[PDB]
Each structure stands twice: as C-alpha cells, then as structure tokens.
Design a protein around this ligand. Sequence first.
Ligand SMILES: [Fe+3]
Ligand SMILES: [Fe+3]
Ligand SMILES: [Fe+3]
Ligand SMILES: [Fe+3]
Ligand code: NI
Ligand code: NI
Ligand code: NI
Ligand code: NI
Lengths: 170, 170, 170, 170
Amino acid sequence: ASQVRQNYHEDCEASINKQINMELYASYVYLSMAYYFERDDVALPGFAKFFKESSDEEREHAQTFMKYQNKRGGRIVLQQIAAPSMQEWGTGLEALQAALDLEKQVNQSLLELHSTASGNNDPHLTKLLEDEYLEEQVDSIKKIGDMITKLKRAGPHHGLGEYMFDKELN
Amino acid sequence: ASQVRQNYHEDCEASINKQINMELYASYVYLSMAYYFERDDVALPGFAKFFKESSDEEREHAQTFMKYQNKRGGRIVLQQIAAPSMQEWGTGLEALQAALDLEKQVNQSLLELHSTASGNNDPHLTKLLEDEYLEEQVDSIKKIGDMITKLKRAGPHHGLGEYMFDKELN
Amino acid sequence: ASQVRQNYHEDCEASINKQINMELYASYVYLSMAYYFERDDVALPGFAKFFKESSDEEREHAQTFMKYQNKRGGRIVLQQIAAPSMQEWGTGLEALQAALDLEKQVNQSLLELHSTASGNNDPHLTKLLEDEYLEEQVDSIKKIGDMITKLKRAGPHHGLGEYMFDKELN
Amino acid sequence: ASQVRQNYHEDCEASINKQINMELYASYVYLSMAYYFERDDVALPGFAKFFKESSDEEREHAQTFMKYQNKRGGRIVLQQIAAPSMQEWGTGLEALQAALDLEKQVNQSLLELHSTASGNNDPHLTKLLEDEYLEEQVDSIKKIGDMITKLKRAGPHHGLGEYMFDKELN
Ligand SMILES: [Fe+3]
Ligand SMILES: [Fe+3]
Ligand SMILES: [Fe+3]
Ligand SMILES: [Fe+3]
Ligand code: NI
Ligand code: NI
Ligand code: NI
Ligand code: NI
C-alpha cells in the first residue's frame, strides 16, 4: 500500500472516485446550460454567465477530491462522463429548477459520503466534506432557491420579467 | 435620590422606561420583517436590508433613552419584549403598511411623552424629544409613505413591479 | 415543504428557534448590565463598554441562527424576550459572575443542540455549532474566568482595585 | 428703543444680565480651584487642568449671553463679581462636591430663566437656553456625578486613590 496511507478505508476511497465523476458530470451539465443560453434564439447572457461559473466551480470541486484522493494515498480512477440529461434547457426557470434538483442530488451523495466516512471513523474525511462541500452545497441550494423565487416574482415565462431578471445575473 | 437629579419628575422617568420598551419592541418587529424577506420563498433582498437597518436604528433609539434616563438620574427598568404581532408579513406593501402604522403608533407615544414633559415643565426632556425623536419620526413616516405610493405605482402585487421596486431598496 | 429543505429535521428547526430566543435574551441581559454601569452612582466605564460589546455580539449570534434557519429551509418563530433576571447587578465581580453563569448556561444549550443535530445525522448543523458557537463560547468563558481571577487579585470590593481593573476594560 | 428689538421683554433682558454675572462668578470660582490645585502642598495637576477648562468654559458661557443680549437689542449691564465663597477647597472630592452644587445652582437659575422666557412667549430665548445652556448643564452635572462616584470608589481621602484618580483627569 501507499507509504502515506493511514486510516483510509477502501469504501471511502471508492466513494470518492464516484463523487469525482459526479462533480465532473455536474460541471458538464452546467457547461451545456451555459452555451445553450448563448444561442442566438435564447440570448440570456446573465444565465449563460451564471452557469459558466457553476461549471468552472464543479470542475474545481472534482479536482479537490482528486487532490484529496492522492493526499490520503488512494488511487484516482476516472470513468466516462455521461452526456448531459438534456441538450436544450427551456427557459431560465426550467434551467434553474433542473440545477436545483441536480444540486440536491449531489448534496444527497455528499451526505452519504459523510455517512460512509463517519461509519469508518475517518474524521479527516468528515472534516473535508463538512468544510469544503456540504457548506458550499447548502449555500448553492439556497442561492438557487432565492433565484427561482425571484424569477417567479418577476415573471418566469419568456417575457419582460425574464429579460430583466437576466440583467441581475450579469 | 440621585446626586445628579434635578427637575426630573417621576412621571417622565416612568414614561421613558415605557418608551424604551416600545423602541426595543419596534426593533424586534423590524428584525422579524428583515429575516422574513430573506426566506427562500420570499427573496426580497431590498426589503430585507431596509428593515434590518430600521431594526438597528430602533435599538439605537432605545439606547439613547437609556443614556438619557441615566443622565437625568432616573433608573432604567427593563420589561419583557413582546413577540412581534405577526411572524409572516405578506408582501412588501403589507410590511410597509404595517411599518407605517407601527411608526405612527410610536409617534403618538412620543407626542404623549412630550405632553408629559411639557406638563411637568421639563424643557430638557422636551428638547430631547423634539431634536432626537419627533424629527426622525416624521421623516420616517414620510419616507415610508413615499415608498408605499411608489410601490403601488410600480405594482404592489407579487409581480414585476415588486421585483423592480425591491432593487430601489438595495 | 421548502424547495431548499434537505436533511433538516423538525427537532433541529425547533431547537434553533429556541436558541435564537436564548441569544436575544443574553443580548438583553448584557444591555441591562451595560447601562447599569453607566449610572452616575456606579460609573464603571470599562465594564459598561465590555457588556455593551457582549450585548452586540449576542444579537449578532441570534441573527446568525436566523440566517441559518432560512438557509436550511426552516421557519423562524420569534417568542417574547424575557426581562433580565435582575435590574441592578451589584459590583463588577457580581456582574462577571452572573455573566460567567449565563455563558455556561448558553454553552449547555449549545451542546444539547449539537446532540440533537448529531442524533439526527445533520453534519451541516454540527459544523455550524462547532465552528461558530462552541468555539466562541469556550473562549468567552475562559476570558470571563480570567477577568474574575484578575478582579479578585486586584480587589473585588468597591475599592481602588475595582477602579484600576475597570481601566483595563476601557 | 433698539432698531432691532422685537418681542424682547424687559424681564428677560434683566434676567440675562443676572445670568451673565452668575456665569462670570462660576468662572471665577473654577479659576480659584484651578490654581489651588497647583499649590506645592496640593499638587493635583489633573484637578487643576479640569477646573481651568471649566473656568474657561464659564467665561465663554457669559460671553454667549452678552452676544445674545446685543443680538436681541437689550443692553448689557455688568456688576461686580463676588470673591469665591472659599479660597481653599480641601481635597479633590470636596472641590468636586462644591462644583456639583454650583452647577446645580446655575441649572436652577437657567430653568427659572426658561420659565421667564416661556411666560413672556419668547421662543427665541427658550431655544437659546435649551440648545446652549440646559443641554450642557445636564451633561456637566452627570460628568461631575460620575467623577465623584469614581473618586469615592478609588479612595476619596488624601491617598493613593486620589493620586491615581488625578491621573485620569490629566
Ligand atoms: Fe460540487
Ligand atoms: Fe424609534
Ligand atoms: Fe452567543
Ligand atoms: Fe455655564
Ligand atoms: Ni414557460
Ligand atoms: Ni396582494
Ligand atoms: Ni462586595
Ligand atoms: Ni477627607
């Protein structure tokens, strides 16, 4: 085994590899949304910028797990990254609602990761998940929830409301 | 009695203690409104900021009466602060209308304080009430009145008008 | 339920609402002490400044729980804030000893909050309590303990010792 | 009569002339105290500085009434300034207690001036007394009261307490 490995269970190492793929996939989904909103027949530059940032952050999130894997002495195994579930995302509200549910799906995965780490008495992994992932995930879900509510107030259907709300995201 | 006390009637000292509690209560009401508007299903950041500032100011107003009480040689007596009348405040217009009526209720109390001070020939207390409270109260009522009118013009019902008007408060 | 709510148990949401009230109450107690020490017949400006800062911090502590409640999708319920247990606090030592016991009462409540969060497998809430409350609480108790010891050394009874020790707090 | 005089009653003009003399007298008393505390066998430089400032302020207070007299069209009449009641003032506490009672004697005179102005429907004179005299007088009495309390705590009798308290006034 690795000269550095200590108190690092095989199940946590495997779950990290799965979470790496999930972060890469979320990054890919947000990249799809980002350039969907730059289409000449969608033209929502604020939504495009918002999802491009989210795509970059999820790719950073995946790399933090990869660095973590190496730091604990595990071995990174990369799988294929699935095509995004959709290729057209509808209106801003429908993309936000899809993002909201993706984020809660990732949050579920992270809490199950924490349960695995807690069950194998790995306080270093539980600290990583609390400090770097579960905190950011709850804030993202709250931010998206706020945005959904604001967009519903401004007018969620392809109209002046969506046009004005898009400026708030720029 | 206090070595500093002079021309300070027991009725004014008692009315100040009542006004302290009323200011603390108004502060609590505005704190309730402030974090009501930060709910993921309300998401009016401008209203939230407006009421958070008002909550801070009313707590400052209470402390100015407490300093005043001590300066005149009276004794501060603190009572319980009642729960806010409501826990959900509806739309922006309904919160502003509730704030407008709270502010005029506080103004009434202050004018009655002035009548007590004037009836006991306390020009120092009448000067405090005119310079530090009655001036600020009239300006607050005018500001809130302006806002109510502006929000009714922009569209008071959970729509684009309320969304845009909220940006003016940010 | 809230679009953002996830892994947030009803018992934690209710305990947070109770802790909000306790923080508001501690803030009120420290406000009472603060302006007690600005009385013309007490005149301990250092103690007054120390308790005024503590009052501000406890009000900030309550707002962090309110933001937290909203972030997790719970609903803030505000109750009345009880009058402070006393209206006169004696000497500096007696106020510090009262503060010490209030702080350990709040610490007990927070550790029980952590037990509730830990029993419902809420690592996000346990992280909040460890990072933002239990750390600050232990440091506050140590600081107050140091001060009590220093004041007993300098001379705790209404004398030169209390007068000099008060300058250290300014 | 004066080309500028308007709504200025003879009783207010006469009472202002009396208050001018009282301010000049208080200034003289504080000058006596100031150089009493610079005696080689008293040597309280902090008390000396405190009373020298108070002497300067009371002389400024007298000149503000003189400017006021001229502004309203009255005529300044200056009387003799009595010798200070004492020539030796004892300890710091005894000088502060004498100052406290002089300040409340001046405050009484000012409130009676306000009653004269209010009885003759002179809102300009009542504004002067509230804004420039009654406000400063209450703050001075509170400050002196605080100092008396602090000096009694530190030790009012010719000892280390008075020596240390004197440094706070420097
Ligand atoms: Fe992520
Ligand atoms: Fe107010
Ligand atoms: Fe706290
Ligand atoms: Fe004066
Ligand atoms: Ni639609
Ligand atoms: Ni409506
Ligand atoms: Ni004692
Ligand atoms: Ni003596």
